[PDB]
Structure 1
Amino acid sequence: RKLCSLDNGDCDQFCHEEQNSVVCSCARGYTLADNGKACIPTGPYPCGKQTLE
C-alpha cells in the first residue's frame, strides 16, 4: 500500500498519483486548503453534507 492506496494519501476527498507523489483535490464547491489535503466549503449548503440547524 503506497501513496493513494495508503489511507487515501491523507486526502480529504480525491487522491491521484503524479510522478511518484500524492496530489489531493476536492469536489466542485470546495477549495483545497493551504496544507494541500483538506477540502473547505466555499459557500452555504455545500454538496455531500447532511443539513444542520
Structure 2
Amino acid sequence: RKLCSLDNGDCDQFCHEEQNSVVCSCARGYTLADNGKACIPTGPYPCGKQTL
C-alpha cells in the first residue's frame, strides 16, 4: 500500500499518481484546501452532502 493505495493518499476525494507522488483533487462545487488534500465546498449545497 503506497501513495493513493494507502488511505487514498490522505486525499478527501480524488487521488491520482503522477511521478511517484500523490496529487489530490475535488468534484465540482468544491475547491482543494490549503493543505492540498481536503475539499472545501463553495456553495450552500455542495454535491454528495446529506443535511440531517
Same fold (TM over 0.5): yes
**2:13 matched to which residue of 1?**
13
How many Å separate the matches in 1 of 2:26 and 2:49? 14
Aligned residues: 52
Query: Partner residue of 1:29?
Result: 29
C-alpha root-mean-square deviation of aligned residues, in Å?
A: 0.7
Alpha-carbon distance, 1:51 to partner: 1.9
TM norm structure 2: 0.96
Kindly provide the CA deviation profile for residues 17-45 of structure 1, in whole angstroms up to 9, marking residues without a partner as x: 01000000000000000000000000111
TM-score, L = length of structure 1: 0.94
Q: 3-state DSSP class of the match of 2:4?
A: helix
Q: Is the 8 A contact 1:45 1:51 kept in 2?
A: no
Structure 2 gaps of 5+ residues are none
1:4 counterpart SS class: helix
